[PDB]
């Protein structure tokens, strides 16, 4: 076996020119798609807040059109899913994880038009879901499409172009190139066996999509928090405690999203009509809240800059948290097209700020800024529910651009993951695959 | 299928013993890396102190610089040749094999040999980084705790070996993420599935970083400041720079390989001619660490000066050519010390040079050469040792100019692409292939 290694070591990092070039056209297409999707969602949110002007005088009629606009767009979203692509439900990260494990089909001819227009509706109604869901999955199918159209053969190409699509997808959903690659080589990849994924090819994909996103999203970051204060060595232990808190909460949030899937599955019983109607009901509630208390609704990217700056009161933060938990569970667990990834960053910001505030009053000699705790805790929920800390930590580091908080973020992130394990918690994306995959067996 | 459902529910379940033993490795790796970094600085300080006491008479101090660095080099080359020949050169290739179970981890030997040996070569002011020492010493420390606590398994043996070498690189650059990404891009068994627990690596990296920060906070290894931004219509320049790194990447691989061979003739395997030649190179480095300090040493001191564009065009060319020579000599000769760091300094110099050319050709892009310096800095690392992802994140963690990420990624990729298309090979894998193929022949 030594002699084979010597043969292999000399042939290391040699990806076929066909794969590299195809990963390029994957990234390009994922980027354009994720740009179109992002622009479409922003237009629908714009039309929706355009009607609340035509009906700004009649408050009951205002609250009516706030519900009825989000409802009709959610219904349309839930429908296109239920009728044309059941796989295009929820996030889609667990679906593309199954595709990389060769246990799920990548029916692109179905998901591409559904997840795109379906998500457009649910996100456009301002439901509490992210773009990751749509863009990562859509990304994976775009990679599959160009594998099929160009009829590319072999384990490397099918795994690589499927991974680079997912990577380009996340990278366009957060303008975070590194995060897309780190997401693949920690979370997306088959976790128990070797895989022929070319990391170099993943890169090219991620690059092109990042470039495509930067062509149409120049000079506006998704999250501008500005350079926060530093973190002194004697402060570190406080981030470990923050970790532990996220660590016990990570598995509990997973039980709620899994249970709520089951609890809402009774309300419709897997019926197309009761689902679409429950779907519009949840959606409408978001558009209502997307006026009366917008912190509780929407993706979650807007309150992040606010909460870090310490502009919310301890009263308001607690309210935001609870109401966002409820709205995150109602949207994701319901099976709407959209990721739980972005709302999980928003939740961690809130809870992190709340801890930070309590930390500031308790420790004046540390000279704390509740915002450093807000950032450390931002990707901490991703590190305790999703169980991808090295994805979360870098995802944050790319959006907030506060490298000087690298240790506190790691310490919190790792604290999240350790207690997430020690309290018997399961990787949310794997846990969803292992339930859908188990449901594929149990009915035989 | 049913196998996977069983696996998924058991994903990320590291045995607490591994996790706790990970924490103990990083701590030991960190503190040792701290002590190594203190010793080398200590010995460098002494050499400057001896130059002060014989400050008059030019040929007198040029001799005491040579002899100070020669004596210390000799001490290193000897400690390696006499007790642990495996601890020569980098050590990164040695540990990679150790992860493939194709090499032994003789910690009882390597630890003191690499520590005190590196102290010699580094402290004398040779063109070698701290990684070599710390990475190897790192793995060996991770082996020590395996043996001492009698931990059983493939996982425990691979994991504690990996975290050690990760924590090693971590405390060598104050770059936690780079260490972790190094393990999962280059260090890990590249062709089969391994039982390396990422969670355990992390914990180890944390500890060594905390240990490094407890001594070296408030002063960074490279301060560059916040550079300008890079507009989109500029990105193509970073592709070209990457292409230049793409062709030079393998040509530098050839030389380091070939100069390993040519320097093997001068001693023929003889412990005495080796030591005396290694002292001659070491002496040359201390002598040059006075008459043109940017050609000798680790090269960390010149990066800031290079990036600021303080050197002229000529001064850069010289510094490059001279540093091509001095890097080979010290690494190729099998002196204990990494090529990792000297390659950063090569990348900056070449980058700044390209940027200086760029600045005058295109006054409309409002360029700052220093941006190309930062994009080129880890481009050599992306084209020689062929770990672009580790390379990019390493630069990002030391320079802190995240707004230059696209330039950094495009250059780094444009290197690894043209390094693949011109025959080149991962330098740390090629050296492993040499050491393994020379073993079964």
């Amino acid at each position, epitope marked *: 076996r030594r002699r084979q290694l010597i043969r292999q070591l000399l042939e290391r990092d040699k990806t076929p020119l066909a794969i590299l070039f195809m990963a390029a056209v994957v990234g390009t297409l994922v980027g354009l798609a994720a740009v179109a999707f992002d622009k479409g969602v922003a237009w629908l949110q714009n039309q929706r807040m355009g009607a609340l002007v035509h009906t700004a005088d009649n408050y009951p009629l205002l609250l009516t059109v706030a519900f009825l606009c989000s409802a009709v767009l959610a219904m349309f979203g839930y429908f296109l899913v239920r009728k044309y692509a059941p796989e295009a439900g929820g996030s889609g990260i667990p679906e593309i994880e199954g595709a990389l494990e060769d246990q799920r089909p990548v029916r692109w001819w179905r998901v591409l038009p559904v997840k795109f227009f379906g998500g457009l509706g649910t996100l456009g109604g301002g439901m509490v879901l992210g773009r990751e869901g749509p863009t990562v999955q859509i990304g994976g199918n775009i990679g599959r499409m160009v594998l099929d159209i160009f009829r590319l053969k072999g384990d490397e190409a099918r795994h690589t172009l499927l991974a680079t699509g997912a990577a380009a997808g996340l990278a366009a959903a957060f303008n975070a190139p590194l995060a897309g690659i780190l997401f693949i080589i920690e979370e997306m990849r088959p976790q128990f066996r070797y895989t022929l994924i070319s990391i170099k090819a993943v890169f090219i994909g991620v690059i092109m999509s990042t470039i495509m996103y930067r062509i149409f999203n*120049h*000079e506006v970051a998704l999250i501008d928090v500005g350079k926060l204060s530093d973190a002194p060595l004697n402060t570190l232990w406080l981030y470990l405690i923050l970790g532990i808190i996220f660590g016990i909460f990570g598995p509990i949030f997973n039980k709620w999203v899994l249970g709520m899937q089951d609890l809402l599955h009774r309300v419709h019983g897997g019926n197309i009509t009761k689902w679409v109607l429950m779907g519009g009901a949840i959606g409408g509630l978001c558009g209502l809240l997307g006026f009366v208390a917008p912190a509780t609704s929407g993706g979650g990217f807007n309150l992040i800059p606010i909460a870090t700056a310490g502009n919310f009161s301890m009263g308001m933060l607690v309210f935001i948290f609870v109401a966002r938990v409820i709205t995150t569970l109602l949207c994701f667990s319901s099976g709407a097209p959209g990721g739980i990834f972005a709302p999980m960053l928003a939740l961690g910001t809130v809870l992190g700020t709340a801890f930070g505030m309590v930390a500031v009053e308790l420790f004046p000699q540390y000279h704390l800024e509740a915002g450093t705790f807000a950032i450390a805790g931002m990707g901490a929920l991703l590190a305790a529910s999703i169980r991808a800390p090295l994805t979360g930590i870098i995802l944050v580091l790319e959006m907030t651009d506060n490298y000087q908080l690298i240790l506190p973020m790691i310490i919190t992130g790792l604290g999240a993951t350790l207690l997430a394990q020690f309290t018997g918690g399961k990787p949310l994306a794997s846990a969803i695959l292992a339930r859908t995959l188990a449901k594929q067996e149990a009915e035989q | 299928r049913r196998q996977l459902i069983r696996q998924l529910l058991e994903r990320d379940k590291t045995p607490l013993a591994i996790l706790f033993m990970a924490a103990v490795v990083g701590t030991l790796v960190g503190l040792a890396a701290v002590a190594f970094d203190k010793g080398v600085a200590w010995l460098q300080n002494q050499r400057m102190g001896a130059l002060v006491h014989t400050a008059d008479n030019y040929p007198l101090l040029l001799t005491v610089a040579f002899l100070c660095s020669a004596v210390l080099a000799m001490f290193g080359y000897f400690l390696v040749r006499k007790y642990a020949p495996e601890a020569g050169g980098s050590g990164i290739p040695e540990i990679e094999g150790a992860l493939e179970d194709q090499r032994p981890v003789r910690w009882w030997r390597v630890l003191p040999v690499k520590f005190f040996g590196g102290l010699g070569t580094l402290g004398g002011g040779m063109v070698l980084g701290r990684e070599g020492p710390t990475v190897q010493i790192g793995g060996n420390i991770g082996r020590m705790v395996l043996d001492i606590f009698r931990l059983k398994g493939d996982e425990a043996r691979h994991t504690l070996l990996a975290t050690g070498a990760a924590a090693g690189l971590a405390a060598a650059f104050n770059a936690p993420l780079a260490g972790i990404l190094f393990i999962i891009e280059e260090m890990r068994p590249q062709f089969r599935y391994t039982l390396i627990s990422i969670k355990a690596v992390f914990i180890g990296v944390i500890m060594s970083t905390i240990m490094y920060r407890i001594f070296n906070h408030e002063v960074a290894l490279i301060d560059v400041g*916040k550079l*300008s931004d890079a*507009p*989109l*219509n*500029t990105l193509w320049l970073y592709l070209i720079l990457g292409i230049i790194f793409g062709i030079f990447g393998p040509i530098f691989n050839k030389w380091v390989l070939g100069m390993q061979d040519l320097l093997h003739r001068v001693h023929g395997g003889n412990i005495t001619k080796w030591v005396l030649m290694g002292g001659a190179i070491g002496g040359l480095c201390g002598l040059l660490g006075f008459v043109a300090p940017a050609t000798s040493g680790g090269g960390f001191n010149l990066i800031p000066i290079a990036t600021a*564009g303080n050197f002229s065009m000529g001064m850069l060319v010289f510094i490059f050519v001279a540093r091509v020579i001095t890097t080979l000599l010290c690494f190729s000769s099998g002196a204990p010390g990494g090529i990792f760091a000297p390659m950063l300094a090569l990348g900056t110099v070449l980058g700044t040079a390209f940027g200086m050319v760029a*600045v005058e050709l295109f*006054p*409309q*892009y*409002h360029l*700052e050469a220093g941006t190309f310096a930062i994009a080129g800095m880890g481009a050599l690392l992306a084209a020689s040792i062929r770990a672009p992802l580790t390379g990019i994140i390493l630069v990002l963690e030391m320079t802190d100019n995240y707004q230059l990420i696209l330039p950094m990624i495009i250059t780094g990729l444009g290197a690894t692409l043209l390094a693949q298309f011109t025959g080149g090979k991962p330098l740390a894998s090629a050296i492993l292939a040499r050491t393994l193929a020379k073993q079964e022949a």
Partner: antibody
Amino acid sequence: VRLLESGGGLVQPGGSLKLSCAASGFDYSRYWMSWVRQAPGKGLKWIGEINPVSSTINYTPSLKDKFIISRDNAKDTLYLQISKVRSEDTALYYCARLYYGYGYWYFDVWGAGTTVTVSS
Amino acid sequence: DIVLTQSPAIMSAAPGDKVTMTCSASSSVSYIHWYQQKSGTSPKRWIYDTSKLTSGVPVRFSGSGSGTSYSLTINTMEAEDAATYYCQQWSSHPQTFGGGTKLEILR
């Protein structure tokens, strides 16, 4: 954001005056600054630019020390020294903060202007 | 240095009219900018990169062109648009301005 250039007025032919533009409301570093002038009734002619670290200063096709563009990041101030002032230098002088979109630079925020009248 | 020439030097149209002015270049240019200078005020970055509108510029304004010909178009002009509109390129150093199109209003 506000640019308030001053120090102009009356100068004797062949003389020399120093214009100062005082900036506020934005980090004055990070930004390239520029000078643009407009002779009465006529259009815009670029004078010169300066980067934040003062390491690059480019001028329009002029002569010796005709224009000397400098800056003091400490005071948030841009300067323009005009030497051997002739009747063509009778104009309105704008300090303009420079920026770009896709990469081809524009004049982002313009100051009010100071008037220079060259006369005896 | 590229010589940009602005088509109408002075033009007059009544509100509601579609108005197109032109900035033509001696050599080839790309991503040219536009400036509005109303009487007695400093120029204001109006259109930039050929067709992007600065924040605050009403959507009645639009820009286009490529190579040598470029045009700023006001779709249904309004009386408050009475200004002088300078174009400017910086695709070739040094940057250079136009002569100006002085838009006048007919009421």
